[PDB]
Amino acid sequence: ALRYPMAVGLNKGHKVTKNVSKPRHSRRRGRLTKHTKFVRDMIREVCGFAPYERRAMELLKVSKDKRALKFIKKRVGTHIRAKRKREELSSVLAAMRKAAAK
């Protein structure tokens, strides 16, 4: 058919050629590096876990995952931050099982 660019609709906009360039280096901020992961895993060996993290893990051992999130969320503050935190502790608990199994 005949079709025009339109100021409304799903394909709205004046048509231009998009140009692809490397992302600005400021956009990699907060990317984990193997050295910074190694340093954080070392501090985790020296220091350990916080009392709230340990209490969360006790909830996760008995498979109280829903209650574990609510405790974590109440302590860290946000759902997304808690979801990421619950996952790490479960990964830690999973690793401890494997190490014991070995």
């Binding site: 005949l2 339109m6 409304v8 609709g9 799903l10 231009v16 998009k18 140009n19």
Partner: protein, 210 residues
């Protein structure tokens, strides 16, 4: 008290506004001072252009102004990179640099790249040591003609591509401008729910199938 028909007015004079009145009786004296600092600056940097560094072209944001272009802050690193100008050398020879600005499309990128190349073609460059020219410097003949420039460098102007009269086709005559717009609004409004309904529909029948 109100009196017959009248506008309801809410003047904002319930503070101590007289303590903070800014008269403008120094306006002509400000205008002279600003001009006198433009002249002493033009003399100070001559033959460099009085206006200042060359600025790029940029399209104004929002739908109210995107039909217009103007002078931006400075050329972007992608623009300078494509034009073979070192970013630290750009400011020394009258070119402005904007590390923040991103080039999203090619055409705008190319327009500033060409603007740079045109500017580099008009640049008359005086040797660092007057008696010892160097590789990139302008010849002594074209230094005798180097005169200061007034006004913005290579002024930016909104040019319109004129289209001549052409015979209207049956395809164009048949196009439905109103219907096309109204249907486009509907499609972009019901897209998300329609996709949801299609997904649920498949699930409902699949459980019947399996």
């Amino acid at each position: 008290a109100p009196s017959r028909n009248g506008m309801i007015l809410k003047p904002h004079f319930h503070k101590d506004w007289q303590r903070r009145v800014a008269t403008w009786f120094n306006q002509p004296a400000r205008k002279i001072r600003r001009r006198k600092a433009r002249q002493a600056r033009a003399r100070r940097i001559a033959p460099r252009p009085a206006a200042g560094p060359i600025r790029p072209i940029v399209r104004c944001p929002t739908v109210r102004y995107h039909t217009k272009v103007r002078a931006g802050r400075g050329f972007s690193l992608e623009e300078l990179r494509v034009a073979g100008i070192h970013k630290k050398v750009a400011r020394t020879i009258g070119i402005s640099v904007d590390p923040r600005r991103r080039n999203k499309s090619t055409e705008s990128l190319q327009a500033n790249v060409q603007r740079l190349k045109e500017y580099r073609s008009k640049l008359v460059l005086f040797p660092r040591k007057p008696s010892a020219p160097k590789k990139g410097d302008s010849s002594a003949e074209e230094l005798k003609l180097a005169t200061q420039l007034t006004g913005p460098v290579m002024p930016i102007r909104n040019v319109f591509k004129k289209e001549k009269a052409r015979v209207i086709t049956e395809e164009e005559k048949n196009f439905k401008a109103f219907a096309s717009l109204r249907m486009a609004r509907a499609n972009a409004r019901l897209f998300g729910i329609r996709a949801k309904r299609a997904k649920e529909a498949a699930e409902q029948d699949v459980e019947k199938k399996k």
